[PDB]
Design a protein around this ligand. Structure first.
Ligand code: LW0
Length: 263
């Protein structure tokens, strides 16, 4: 069946020039709204949530892991590294790398998380261990953002990512202190005000992780605490036909607004 909310999302998509994927979980009743919910989309930097969560999981059996120093060398810098470049020829702890990856979208920090997990397949292995059979990470930064249409590498579906984000932030995939740390990091994101947040009432509290890539790929995944309501989990993925297409964060805001008006 096609719901009123799904028809509004289809109209938004038709006027956007691209392909839109949405998954909402409303934890008030566990109901879900999906739009292209089982189609694959390139995750881009939204995958940084899975990598940070995997390191948090490791830290449950290594109390000092998040304080372990990691060498940052000049060769480790990639294309966008606003935090890591200040520490070249020095060190950052895994907590510092996680915070930089999540809150500033630092790509060198992401690569250190991936290396701590043994490579992209270690992030995928963590996803499988928490019940996500869909997520796949295949490459490091920056090439995981190529976002080529039809390419399965570094993709997931909106339904899978929403379920996983719920388990990580509101469920019990992580220990309680680790879940709280992940939520704190997401709530402190610096990059998200133009994306899902821009479509929601301003009184609501949001933690989110954005992503952007080639093909105008514009993504956001969020946990939302509405005024007077149980939390929502919302994934909005968007990608366009031309490699050099511009970012469209307004499309993600519009999708979130449609979702919020449909509650
Ligand atoms: O790594 C890339 N962009 C990051 C992704 C990161 C961000 N965007 N939205 N959330 N995080 C960000 C922020 C500022 C500047 C660059 C970047 C990329 C994109 C296309 C092609 C490519 F080979 C790499």
């Amino acid at each position: 069946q096609t719901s009123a909310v799904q028809q509004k999302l289809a109209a938004l998509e038709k006027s956007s020039g691209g392909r839109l994927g949405v998954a909402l979980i409303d934890t008030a009743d566990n109901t879900q709204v999906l739009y292209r919910g089982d189609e694959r989309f390139p995750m881009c930097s939204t995958s940084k949530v899975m990598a940070a969560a995997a390191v948090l999981k490791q830290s449950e059996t290594q109390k000092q892991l998040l304080n372990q120093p990691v060498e940052i060398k000049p060769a480790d810098l990639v294309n966008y590294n606003p935090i890591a470049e200040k520490h070249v020829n020095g060190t950052m702890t895994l907590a510092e790398l996680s915070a930089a990856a999540l809150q500033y979208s630092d790509n060198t920090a992401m690569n250190k998380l991936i290396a701590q997990l043994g490579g992209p397949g270690g992030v995928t292995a963590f996803a499988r261990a928490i019940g996500d059979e869909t997520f796949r990470l295949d490459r490091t930064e920056p090439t995981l953002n190529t976002a080529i249409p039809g390419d399965p590498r570094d993709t997931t579906t909106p339904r899978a990512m929403a379920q996983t984000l719920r388990q990580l932030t509101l469920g019990h995939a992580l220990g309680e202190t680790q879940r709280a740390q992940l939520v704190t990091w997401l709530k402190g994101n610096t990059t998200g005000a133009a994306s899902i947040r821009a479509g929601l009432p301003t009184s609501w509290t949001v933690g989110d992780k954005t992503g952007s890539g080639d093909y105008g790929t514009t993504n956001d995944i969020a946990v939302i605490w509405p005024q007077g309501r149980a939390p929502l989990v919302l994934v909005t993925y968007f990608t366009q036909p031309q490699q050099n297409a511009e970012s469209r964060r307004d499309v993600l805001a519009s999708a979130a607004r449609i979702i919020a008006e449909g509650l």
